[PDB]
């Protein structure tokens, strides 16, 4: 049922088609896979007058387009390139519908782009509509991306209710595949007063988080980016357990990040731990090198070791060259030994 113009455009009739040529058909083009891309591209360099001509047509259909697989990109491009009065008009259409839009597969994209594009007060007015619905949004396939963008974009005073809603839920959310990403954003962007209670709760569950499919991601984040004191708390949960945890599908990630990112003394302590440990009739290092997960830990220990600790590891690794060649991943440590021994 396409218009002749949209059919002609799709058949490459018009290599010099312009926004002005679309009058009457703008909503139809916006809902088309190819027509939408055309409008998206043209909006970048359109004159304000050309943008207004398009906007006049789409405004009546704005909510429909926000929730359309292809039309949402056109609304995003008005947040990106539109005038302040166009963004005003769109924020108006969004008002009172931020929650359903945030939960909508395409509308969540529009709210995200709006947050990147609008004033601090406009942002505050949008995000408050999520009050009472924070955990629902955080776990939602679409809403979680809106909550993440709020944390990246919005003033901390206007975010506080999100932080408050996490109290008592940090463990549940950190072990959730979408929740764990929101927790990471909080750790990056929120103020120290906001992250303090989140971290305190995280440290109450470290043992379980390090072994969790998604929780280990949060623990890794604190190792890579957090304050020394928080890293030390995590190290306290790894010491005495390096051999066991290095062989764990998920906790091995955490062990590696301890070796790479913890303090100089902490890194040395964990390395020392496996250098002096025998795993029955085999070395702890022997056990670790044949393991699909722990081998990478050993790789990092070699990389991070001080010249003195490195001497010892390389010395204990050497008699197991033939064992290394059996494994697809033995490649890396072998190459390290070769480089190390001239």
mmCIF file of C-alpha atoms in Angstrom:
data_model
loop_
_atom_site.group_PDB
_atom_site.id
_atom_site.type_symbol
_atom_site.label_atom_id
_atom_site.label_comp_id
_atom_site.label_asym_id
_atom_site.label_seq_id
_atom_site.Cartn_x
_atom_site.Cartn_y
_atom_site.Cartn_z
ATOM 1 C CA UNK A 1 0.000 0.000 0.000
ATOM 2 C CA UNK A 2 3.004 2.339 -0.270
ATOM 3 C CA UNK A 3 2.758 5.771 -1.887
ATOM 4 C CA UNK A 4 4.226 6.061 -5.394
ATOM 5 C CA UNK A 5 6.934 8.337 -3.945
ATOM 6 C CA UNK A 6 8.037 5.779 -1.353
ATOM 7 C CA UNK A 7 7.978 2.991 -3.983
ATOM 8 C CA UNK A 8 10.026 5.175 -6.381
ATOM 9 C CA UNK A 9 12.488 6.040 -3.631
ATOM 10 C CA UNK A 10 12.891 2.324 -2.770
ATOM 11 C CA UNK A 11 13.503 1.569 -6.462
ATOM 12 C CA UNK A 12 16.296 4.153 -6.609
ATOM 13 C CA UNK A 13 14.457 6.479 -8.944
ATOM 14 C CA UNK A 14 15.605 9.627 -7.158
ATOM 15 C CA UNK A 15 19.338 9.907 -6.269
ATOM 16 C CA UNK A 16 18.836 13.586 -5.455
ATOM 17 C CA UNK A 17 15.623 13.315 -3.413
ATOM 18 C CA UNK A 18 15.373 16.003 -0.668
ATOM 19 C CA UNK A 19 13.305 16.484 2.491
ATOM 20 C CA UNK A 20 11.154 19.084 0.739
ATOM 21 C CA UNK A 21 10.121 16.412 -1.808
ATOM 22 C CA UNK A 22 8.595 14.345 0.945
ATOM 23 C CA UNK A 23 5.762 16.742 1.912
ATOM 24 C CA UNK A 24 2.634 14.690 2.656
ATOM 25 C CA UNK A 25 4.530 11.436 3.065
ATOM 26 C CA UNK A 26 6.839 12.141 6.020
ATOM 27 C CA UNK A 27 5.175 9.795 8.534
ATOM 28 C CA UNK A 28 5.034 7.001 5.919
ATOM 29 C CA UNK A 29 8.766 7.445 5.080
ATOM 30 C CA UNK A 30 9.622 7.542 8.818
ATOM 31 C CA UNK A 31 7.940 4.113 9.300
ATOM 32 C CA UNK A 32 9.845 2.561 6.367
ATOM 33 C CA UNK A 33 13.199 0.824 6.886
ATOM 34 C CA UNK A 34 14.833 2.742 3.989
ATOM 35 C CA UNK A 35 12.725 5.909 4.178
ATOM 36 C CA UNK A 36 13.643 6.314 7.822
ATOM 37 C CA UNK A 37 17.389 6.067 7.096
ATOM 38 C CA UNK A 38 16.895 8.689 4.334
ATOM 39 C CA UNK A 39 15.238 11.186 6.760
ATOM 40 C CA UNK A 40 17.820 10.395 9.481
ATOM 41 C CA UNK A 41 20.667 11.217 7.114
ATOM 42 C CA UNK A 42 19.080 14.350 5.654
ATOM 43 C CA UNK A 43 18.300 15.856 9.046
ATOM 44 C CA UNK A 44 22.030 16.275 9.823
ATOM 45 C CA UNK A 45 22.534 19.072 7.303
ATOM 46 C CA UNK A 46 19.001 20.258 6.732
ATOM 47 C CA UNK A 47 18.466 23.971 7.256
ATOM 48 C CA UNK A 48 16.341 24.855 10.294
ATOM 49 C CA UNK A 49 13.534 25.651 7.808
ATOM 50 C CA UNK A 50 13.816 22.186 6.263
ATOM 51 C CA UNK A 51 13.773 20.609 9.703
ATOM 52 C CA UNK A 52 10.637 22.574 10.602
ATOM 53 C CA UNK A 53 8.864 21.415 7.396
ATOM 54 C CA UNK A 54 9.492 17.780 8.445
ATOM 55 C CA UNK A 55 8.629 18.472 12.099
ATOM 56 C CA UNK A 56 5.244 19.981 11.202
ATOM 57 C CA UNK A 57 4.238 16.654 9.770
ATOM 58 C CA UNK A 58 5.606 14.317 12.316
ATOM 59 C CA UNK A 59 4.467 16.137 15.415
ATOM 60 C CA UNK A 60 0.880 14.883 15.180
ATOM 61 C CA UNK A 61 2.225 11.287 14.967
ATOM 62 C CA UNK A 62 5.060 11.738 17.424
ATOM 63 C CA UNK A 63 4.040 9.153 20.042
ATOM 64 C CA UNK A 64 3.258 6.550 17.351
ATOM 65 C CA UNK A 65 6.680 7.184 15.858
ATOM 66 C CA UNK A 66 8.462 6.995 19.244
ATOM 67 C CA UNK A 67 7.185 3.417 19.582
ATOM 68 C CA UNK A 68 7.844 2.420 15.943
ATOM 69 C CA UNK A 69 10.687 0.141 14.891
ATOM 70 C CA UNK A 70 11.906 2.641 12.294
ATOM 71 C CA UNK A 71 10.126 5.875 13.180
ATOM 72 C CA UNK A 72 11.864 6.087 16.574
ATOM 73 C CA UNK A 73 15.133 6.922 14.816
ATOM 74 C CA UNK A 74 13.543 9.982 13.241
ATOM 75 C CA UNK A 75 12.383 11.226 16.636
ATOM 76 C CA UNK A 76 15.888 10.598 18.011
ATOM 77 C CA UNK A 77 17.301 12.730 15.200
ATOM 78 C CA UNK A 78 15.061 15.620 16.264
ATOM 79 C CA UNK A 79 16.544 15.427 19.737
ATOM 80 C CA UNK A 80 19.946 15.358 18.106
ATOM 81 C CA UNK A 81 19.493 18.161 15.495
ATOM 82 C CA UNK A 82 16.240 19.846 16.386
ATOM 83 C CA UNK A 83 15.674 23.368 17.626
ATOM 84 C CA UNK A 84 14.954 24.067 21.282
ATOM 85 C CA UNK A 85 11.262 24.629 20.389
ATOM 86 C CA UNK A 86 11.116 21.208 18.652
ATOM 87 C CA UNK A 87 12.693 19.488 21.653
ATOM 88 C CA UNK A 88 10.198 21.371 23.846
ATOM 89 C CA UNK A 89 7.300 20.032 21.739
ATOM 90 C CA UNK A 90 8.651 16.476 21.963
ATOM 91 C CA UNK A 91 9.238 16.671 25.776
ATOM 92 C CA UNK A 92 5.632 17.795 26.019
ATOM 93 C CA UNK A 93 4.367 14.756 24.120
ATOM 94 C CA UNK A 94 6.514 12.533 26.327
ATOM 95 C CA UNK A 95 5.264 14.061 29.611
ATOM 96 C CA UNK A 96 3.143 11.626 31.641
ATOM 97 C CA UNK A 97 4.254 8.712 29.396
ATOM 98 C CA UNK A 98 7.902 8.321 30.432
ATOM 99 C CA UNK A 99 7.257 4.963 32.175
ATOM 100 C CA UNK A 100 5.487 3.200 29.250
ATOM 101 C CA UNK A 101 8.001 4.699 26.821
ATOM 102 C CA UNK A 102 10.958 3.488 28.972
ATOM 103 C CA UNK A 103 9.494 -0.036 28.982
ATOM 104 C CA UNK A 104 8.917 0.021 25.194
ATOM 105 C CA UNK A 105 11.413 -1.540 22.841
ATOM 106 C CA UNK A 106 11.776 1.614 20.667
ATOM 107 C CA UNK A 107 10.469 4.231 23.099
ATOM 108 C CA UNK A 108 13.371 3.437 25.499
ATOM 109 C CA UNK A 109 15.728 4.671 22.698
ATOM 110 C CA UNK A 110 13.839 7.898 22.472
ATOM 111 C CA UNK A 111 13.962 8.539 26.244
ATOM 112 C CA UNK A 112 17.731 7.757 26.184
ATOM 113 C CA UNK A 113 18.380 10.247 23.358
ATOM 114 C CA UNK A 114 16.131 12.830 25.049
ATOM 115 C CA UNK A 115 18.257 12.550 28.235
ATOM 116 C CA UNK A 116 21.409 13.224 26.188
ATOM 117 C CA UNK A 117 19.806 16.265 24.543
ATOM 118 C CA UNK A 118 17.576 18.222 26.962
ATOM 119 C CA UNK A 119 18.135 20.699 29.826
ATOM 120 C CA UNK A 120 18.816 19.670 33.437
ATOM 121 C CA UNK A 121 15.305 20.674 34.426
ATOM 122 C CA UNK A 122 13.768 18.791 31.498
ATOM 123 C CA UNK A 123 15.788 15.733 32.527
ATOM 124 C CA UNK A 124 14.657 16.006 36.184
ATOM 125 C CA UNK A 125 11.016 16.247 35.134
ATOM 126 C CA UNK A 126 11.318 13.124 32.949
ATOM 127 C CA UNK A 127 13.166 10.912 35.403
ATOM 128 C CA UNK A 128 10.840 11.615 38.328
ATOM 129 C CA UNK A 129 8.080 9.692 36.461
ATOM 130 C CA UNK A 130 10.092 6.565 37.243
ATOM 131 C CA UNK A 131 9.610 7.087 40.987
ATOM 132 C CA UNK A 132 7.841 3.996 42.315
ATOM 133 C CA UNK A 133 8.976 1.911 39.364
ATOM 134 C CA UNK A 134 12.740 1.862 39.680
ATOM 135 C CA UNK A 135 13.358 -1.848 40.274
ATOM 136 C CA UNK A 136 10.803 -2.779 37.567
ATOM 137 C CA UNK A 137 12.718 -0.592 35.119
ATOM 138 C CA UNK A 138 16.142 -1.833 36.155
ATOM 139 C CA UNK A 139 15.188 -5.471 35.466
ATOM 140 C CA UNK A 140 13.274 -4.730 32.287
ATOM 141 C CA UNK A 141 14.760 -5.665 28.875
ATOM 142 C CA UNK A 142 14.149 -2.068 27.706
ATOM 143 C CA UNK A 143 13.874 0.023 30.889
ATOM 144 C CA UNK A 144 17.322 -0.896 32.140
ATOM 145 C CA UNK A 145 18.901 1.128 29.324
ATOM 146 C CA UNK A 146 16.882 4.199 30.396
ATOM 147 C CA UNK A 147 18.006 3.837 34.008
ATOM 148 C CA UNK A 148 21.649 3.519 32.854
ATOM 149 C CA UNK A 149 21.333 6.679 30.735
ATOM 150 C CA UNK A 150 19.748 8.554 33.694
ATOM 151 C CA UNK A 151 22.818 7.693 35.809
ATOM 152 C CA UNK A 152 25.194 8.831 33.030
ATOM 153 C CA UNK A 153 23.367 12.071 32.190
ATOM 154 C CA UNK A 154 21.296 13.461 35.082
ATOM 155 C CA UNK A 155 22.306 15.651 38.032
ATOM 156 C CA UNK A 156 22.947 13.591 41.193
ATOM 157 C CA UNK A 157 20.227 15.473 43.186
ATOM 158 C CA UNK A 158 17.720 14.348 40.602
ATOM 159 C CA UNK A 159 18.910 10.668 40.758
ATOM 160 C CA UNK A 160 18.878 10.145 44.466
ATOM 161 C CA UNK A 161 15.560 8.223 44.456
ATOM 162 C CA UNK A 162 17.123 5.575 42.180
ATOM 163 C CA UNK A 163 19.977 5.061 44.673
ATOM 164 C CA UNK A 164 17.517 4.883 47.554
ATOM 165 C CA UNK A 165 15.458 2.215 45.717
ATOM 166 C CA UNK A 166 18.548 -0.047 45.540
ATOM 167 C CA UNK A 167 18.863 -0.250 49.356
ATOM 168 C CA UNK A 168 18.611 -3.917 50.374
ATOM 169 C CA UNK A 169 18.576 -4.981 46.702
ATOM 170 C CA UNK A 170 22.210 -4.612 45.692
ATOM 171 C CA UNK A 171 22.955 -8.352 45.813
ATOM 172 C CA UNK A 172 19.795 -9.335 43.841
ATOM 173 C CA UNK A 173 20.430 -6.626 41.239
ATOM 174 C CA UNK A 174 24.190 -7.321 40.882
ATOM 175 C CA UNK A 175 23.363 -10.977 40.046
ATOM 176 C CA UNK A 176 20.820 -9.885 37.377
ATOM 177 C CA UNK A 177 21.997 -9.585 33.763
ATOM 178 C CA UNK A 178 20.528 -6.098 33.302
ATOM 179 C CA UNK A 179 20.742 -5.028 36.976
ATOM 180 C CA UNK A 180 24.508 -5.574 37.040
ATOM 181 C CA UNK A 181 24.976 -2.957 34.259
ATOM 182 C CA UNK A 182 22.960 -0.344 36.222
ATOM 183 C CA UNK A 183 25.124 -1.014 39.316
ATOM 184 C CA UNK A 184 28.272 -0.482 37.214
ATOM 185 C CA UNK A 185 26.970 2.890 35.960
ATOM 186 C CA UNK A 186 26.193 3.983 39.526
ATOM 187 C CA UNK A 187 29.786 3.160 40.554
ATOM 188 C CA UNK A 188 31.121 5.299 37.694
ATOM 189 C CA UNK A 189 28.956 8.397 37.741
ATOM 190 C CA UNK A 190 27.315 8.847 41.111
ATOM 191 C CA UNK A 191 28.788 10.956 43.909
ATOM 192 C CA UNK A 192 30.831 9.454 46.726
ATOM 193 C CA UNK A 193 27.894 9.898 49.136
ATOM 194 C CA UNK A 194 25.712 7.913 46.756
ATOM 195 C CA UNK A 195 28.170 5.107 46.013
ATOM 196 C CA UNK A 196 29.124 4.630 49.694
ATOM 197 C CA UNK A 197 25.919 2.760 50.707
ATOM 198 C CA UNK A 198 25.951 0.738 47.483
ATOM 199 C CA UNK A 199 29.556 -0.382 48.097
ATOM 200 C CA UNK A 200 28.850 -1.158 51.786
ATOM 201 C CA UNK A 201 26.087 -3.517 50.667
ATOM 202 C CA UNK A 202 28.252 -5.010 47.906
ATOM 203 C CA UNK A 203 30.965 -5.933 50.428
ATOM 204 C CA UNK A 204 28.351 -7.809 52.511
ATOM 205 C CA UNK A 205 27.963 -10.306 49.647
ATOM 206 C CA UNK A 206 31.388 -10.528 47.964
ATOM 207 C CA UNK A 207 31.886 -14.276 48.482
ATOM 208 C CA UNK A 208 28.682 -15.035 46.608
ATOM 209 C CA UNK A 209 29.082 -12.286 44.017
ATOM 210 C CA UNK A 210 32.547 -13.422 42.882
ATOM 211 C CA UNK A 211 31.106 -16.821 41.947
ATOM 212 C CA UNK A 212 28.000 -15.486 40.233
ATOM 213 C CA UNK A 213 27.517 -15.384 36.446
ATOM 214 C CA UNK A 214 26.774 -11.602 36.527
ATOM 215 C CA UNK A 215 27.887 -10.617 39.995
ATOM 216 C CA UNK A 216 31.533 -11.267 39.166
ATOM 217 C CA UNK A 217 31.247 -8.434 36.597
ATOM 218 C CA UNK A 218 30.437 -5.965 39.389
ATOM 219 C CA UNK A 219 33.321 -7.146 41.521
ATOM 220 C CA UNK A 220 35.688 -6.847 38.508
ATOM 221 C CA UNK A 221 34.473 -3.274 38.037
ATOM 222 C CA UNK A 222 35.438 -2.261 41.613
ATOM 223 C CA UNK A 223 38.901 -3.799 41.079
ATOM 224 C CA UNK A 224 39.460 -1.900 37.825
ATOM 225 C CA UNK A 225 38.024 1.467 38.889
ATOM 226 C CA UNK A 226 37.386 1.677 42.613
ATOM 227 C CA UNK A 227 39.179 3.119 45.625
ATOM 228 C CA UNK A 228 42.077 1.142 47.145
ATOM 229 C CA UNK A 229 40.067 0.461 50.319
ATOM 230 C CA UNK A 230 37.318 -1.240 48.324
ATOM 231 C CA UNK A 231 39.832 -3.254 46.345
ATOM 232 C CA UNK A 232 41.416 -4.415 49.620
ATOM 233 C CA UNK A 233 38.062 -5.669 50.902
ATOM 234 C CA UNK A 234 37.658 -7.761 47.777
ATOM 235 C CA UNK A 235 41.241 -9.047 48.063
ATOM 236 C CA UNK A 236 40.348 -10.168 51.606
ATOM 237 C CA UNK A 237 37.741 -12.466 50.020
ATOM 238 C CA UNK A 238 40.249 -14.006 47.616
ATOM 239 C CA UNK A 239 43.302 -14.630 49.782
ATOM 240 C CA UNK A 240 43.579 -18.272 50.909
ATOM 241 C CA UNK A 241 41.298 -19.267 48.005
ATOM 242 C CA UNK A 242 43.445 -18.450 44.928
ATOM 243 C CA UNK A 243 43.873 -22.060 43.703
ATOM 244 C CA UNK A 244 40.187 -22.976 44.106
ATOM 245 C CA UNK A 245 38.777 -19.713 42.711
ATOM 246 C CA UNK A 246 41.208 -19.578 39.721
ATOM 247 C CA UNK A 247 39.547 -22.815 38.476
ATOM 248 C CA UNK A 248 36.019 -21.395 38.843
ATOM 249 C CA UNK A 249 34.301 -20.340 35.593
ATOM 250 C CA UNK A 250 33.348 -16.936 37.032
ATOM 251 C CA UNK A 251 35.529 -16.281 40.066
ATOM 252 C CA UNK A 252 38.658 -16.762 37.887
ATOM 253 C CA UNK A 253 37.798 -13.358 36.308
ATOM 254 C CA UNK A 254 37.941 -11.823 39.766
ATOM 255 C CA UNK A 255 41.220 -13.523 40.689
ATOM 256 C CA UNK A 256 42.774 -12.206 37.464
ATOM 257 C CA UNK A 257 41.595 -8.683 38.169
ATOM 258 C CA UNK A 258 43.030 -8.889 41.712
ATOM 259 C CA UNK A 259 46.393 -9.880 40.224
ATOM 260 C CA UNK A 260 46.210 -7.057 37.676
ATOM 261 C CA UNK A 261 44.624 -4.216 39.649
ATOM 262 C CA UNK A 262 45.087 -4.653 43.407
ATOM 263 C CA UNK A 263 47.924 -3.073 45.434
ATOM 264 C CA UNK A 264 51.565 -3.967 44.967
ATOM 265 C CA UNK A 265 51.666 -5.947 48.257
ATOM 266 C CA UNK A 266 48.270 -7.564 47.543
ATOM 267 C CA UNK A 267 49.341 -8.724 44.070
ATOM 268 C CA UNK A 268 52.528 -10.165 45.613
ATOM 269 C CA UNK A 269 50.607 -11.967 48.371
ATOM 270 C CA UNK A 270 48.286 -13.764 45.927
ATOM 271 C CA UNK A 271 51.152 -14.775 43.635
ATOM 272 C CA UNK A 272 53.212 -16.003 46.614
ATOM 273 C CA UNK A 273 50.176 -18.084 47.676
ATOM 274 C CA UNK A 274 50.190 -20.312 44.580
ATOM 275 C CA UNK A 275 53.986 -20.428 44.284
ATOM 276 C CA UNK A 276 54.316 -22.220 47.621
ATOM 277 C CA UNK A 277 51.245 -24.444 47.416
ATOM 278 C CA UNK A 278 51.259 -28.076 46.303
ATOM 279 C CA UNK A 279 48.002 -29.553 44.976
ATOM 280 C CA UNK A 280 48.582 -33.092 46.245
ATOM 281 C CA UNK A 281 51.292 -34.810 44.152
ATOM 282 C CA UNK A 282 51.357 -31.839 41.760
ATOM 283 C CA UNK A 283 52.334 -28.172 42.094
ATOM 284 C CA UNK A 284 49.526 -25.599 42.477
ATOM 285 C CA UNK A 285 50.923 -23.902 39.364
ATOM 286 C CA UNK A 286 50.901 -27.276 37.565
ATOM 287 C CA UNK A 287 47.194 -27.617 38.388
ATOM 288 C CA UNK A 288 46.476 -24.032 37.338
ATOM 289 C CA UNK A 289 48.289 -24.234 33.995
ATOM 290 C CA UNK A 290 46.303 -27.202 32.732
ATOM 291 C CA UNK A 291 43.026 -25.552 33.780
ATOM 292 C CA UNK A 292 40.980 -23.733 31.122
ATOM 293 C CA UNK A 293 40.282 -20.819 33.503
ATOM 294 C CA UNK A 294 43.322 -20.694 35.816
ATOM 295 C CA UNK A 295 45.856 -20.729 32.972
ATOM 296 C CA UNK A 296 44.939 -17.122 32.243
ATOM 297 C CA UNK A 297 45.425 -16.253 35.939
ATOM 298 C CA UNK A 298 48.953 -17.684 35.738
ATOM 299 C CA UNK A 299 49.563 -15.678 32.525
ATOM 300 C CA UNK A 300 48.689 -12.487 34.445
ATOM 301 C CA UNK A 301 50.793 -13.457 37.462
ATOM 302 C CA UNK A 302 53.804 -13.774 35.130
ATOM 303 C CA UNK A 303 53.007 -10.340 33.618
ATOM 304 C CA UNK A 304 52.445 -8.618 36.980
ATOM 305 C CA UNK A 305 55.158 -10.308 39.049
ATOM 306 C CA UNK A 306 58.060 -8.217 40.381
ATOM 307 C CA UNK A 307 61.420 -9.438 38.946
ATOM 308 C CA UNK A 308 61.956 -11.469 42.177
ATOM 309 C CA UNK A 309 58.583 -13.175 42.326
ATOM 310 C CA UNK A 310 58.800 -13.714 38.503
ATOM 311 C CA UNK A 311 62.112 -15.598 38.816
ATOM 312 C CA UNK A 312 60.398 -18.080 41.153
ATOM 313 C CA UNK A 313 57.274 -18.594 38.999
ATOM 314 C CA UNK A 314 59.242 -19.067 35.772
ATOM 315 C CA UNK A 315 61.474 -21.510 37.678
ATOM 316 C CA UNK A 316 58.464 -23.533 38.848
ATOM 317 C CA UNK A 317 56.785 -23.364 35.411
ATOM 318 C CA UNK A 318 59.789 -24.619 33.409
ATOM 319 C CA UNK A 319 59.623 -28.386 34.185
ATOM 320 C CA UNK A 320 56.065 -28.551 32.776
ATOM 321 C CA UNK A 321 56.814 -27.427 29.181
ATOM 322 C CA UNK A 322 55.686 -30.785 27.730
ATOM 323 C CA UNK A 323 52.431 -30.605 29.734
ATOM 324 C CA UNK A 324 51.795 -27.107 28.338
ATOM 325 C CA UNK A 325 52.062 -28.245 24.694
ATOM 326 C CA UNK A 326 49.062 -30.573 25.243
ATOM 327 C CA UNK A 327 46.689 -27.617 25.682
ATOM 328 C CA UNK A 328 45.355 -25.240 23.028
ATOM 329 C CA UNK A 329 45.998 -22.382 25.485
ATOM 330 C CA UNK A 330 49.488 -23.559 26.520
ATOM 331 C CA UNK A 331 50.668 -21.257 23.709
ATOM 332 C CA UNK A 332 50.774 -18.088 25.849
ATOM 333 C CA UNK A 333 52.866 -19.234 28.848
ATOM 334 C CA UNK A 334 55.205 -21.207 26.569
ATOM 335 C CA UNK A 335 55.888 -17.988 24.650
ATOM 336 C CA UNK A 336 56.511 -16.179 27.953
ATOM 337 C CA UNK A 337 59.056 -18.840 29.032
ATOM 338 C CA UNK A 338 60.758 -18.595 25.612
ATOM 339 C CA UNK A 339 61.009 -14.811 25.862
ATOM 340 C CA UNK A 340 62.200 -15.126 29.494
ATOM 341 C CA UNK A 341 64.972 -17.655 28.762
ATOM 342 C CA UNK A 342 66.536 -15.632 25.868
#
